[PDB]
Amino acid sequence: AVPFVEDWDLVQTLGEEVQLAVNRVTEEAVAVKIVDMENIKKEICINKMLNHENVVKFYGHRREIQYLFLEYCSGGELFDRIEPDIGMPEPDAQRFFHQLMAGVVYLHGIGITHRDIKPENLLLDERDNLKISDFGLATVFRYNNRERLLNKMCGTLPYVAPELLKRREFHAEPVDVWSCGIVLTAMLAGELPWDQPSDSCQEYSDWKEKKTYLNPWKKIDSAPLALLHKILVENPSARITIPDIKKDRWYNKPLKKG
């Protein structure tokens, strides 16, 4: 074994903590999540389940203050790529949305729901490949092929699905689909549509009344807007599922060169 190979230097804070760690010998870069301690114990267990190119990789943890060794994403947060009131070019948004769907399909396939999808939690590597990040709110919604309904209110209000605010229990998967829809809206409009999806929120009422001549909707082309009409559906049982998102016209529209 090579001496010093287990030493990592903390080179800079990534966000309050998360530190950029660089290996003393190989100079490999990883992100180290440092948390001063059960909620963290659940995060580690779920992270140990994960292995997908669009999910932040988990390398392991040191017990010691908990240390989480995570995939370093040098491109930063998707959040920062969104220009206020503008968004980003549609081809870039579609590519990010494809990779988001890939990561969410993977998590749902192993029975995990993230529960807080938003641009702050979608990170980018050196090639701007998207990675779903931070499973501190994640939980199991399917185990031994049996679905468990959720009831814990959590997430982030502008991104959260209406059923969470309205119903005692709800299916996990439609909630993640909804937040992905809000992320898509943010990417294409550079603004979030409403403070929260409540009947008291005027902007949300305007949407249910199909007033798409207003912002953010009028900034969005008809093709992606049509997908958003199928995702941001109030009734989670009527809301489009991911298999059907994969069949959507805009989702399959050639837009971006390699």
Ligand X SMILES: C[C@H](OC(=O)Nc1ccc(Cl)c(Cl)c1)c1nc2ccccc2[nH]1
Number of residues that bind ligand X (CB under 6 A): 10
Find out whether 138 and 115 touch, Cβ atoms under 8 Å.
yes
Considering the rule CB under 6 A, would residue 100 count as an interface residue with ligand X? no
Instruction: Tell which residue, 16, 39, 19, has the closest CA to residue 29.
Output: 19
**Shortest distance, position 189 Cβ to ligand X, whole Å:** 7
Q: Where are the alpha helices (DSSP H) in 26-120?
A: 39-47, 90-109
Shortest distance, position 65 Cβ to ligand X, whole Å:
31
* Residue 6 labeled ligand binder: no
258 binds ligand X (CB under 6 A): no
- Give the position of tokens 């990170």: 123
Instruction: Give the residue, chosen from 190, 230, 248, 251, that forms a contact with ligand X under the rule CB under 6 A.
Output: 190
- Name which position in 3, 84, 254, 258 contacts ligand X (CB under 6 A): 84
191 binds ligand X (CB under 6 A): yes
Among the listed residues 256, 194, 198, 255, the one whose alpha carbon sits nearest the alpha carbon of residue 228: 194
Tell me: does residue 186 bind ligand X (CB under 6 A): yes
Strands 139-140 and 112-113: antiparallel
Sequence-distant (≥ 6) Cβ neighbours of residue 109 within 8 angstroms: none
Regarding 119 and contact with ligand X (CB under 6 A), the answer is: yes
Cα–Cα dist 77/213, whole Å: 30
> Angle between the 172-189 and 222-231 helix axes, to the nearest 10 degrees?
150
Q: Which is nearer to ligand X, 53 or 80 (CB)?
A: 80
Phi, psi angles (nearest 5°) of residue 140: -80, 125
Q: Is position 206 annotated as part of the catalytic site?
A: no
Please identify which residue in 9, 53, 80, 221 interacts with ligand X, judged by CB under 6 A.
80
Interaction between residue 16 and ligand X (CB under 6 A): no
Q: Does residue 192 touch ligand X according to CB under 6 A?
A: yes
Whose Cβ is closer to ligand X: residue 138's or residue 182's? 182
75 is a contact residue toward ligand X (CB under 6 A): no
**What does the alpha-carbon distance between residue 160 and residue 116 come to, in Å, rounded to a whole number?**
8
| Identified catalytic residue from 9, 36, 85, 116 | 116
Positions annotated as catalytic residues are 116
Where on the chain is the footprint of ligand X (CB under 6 A)? 79-80, 82-84, 119, 186, 190-192
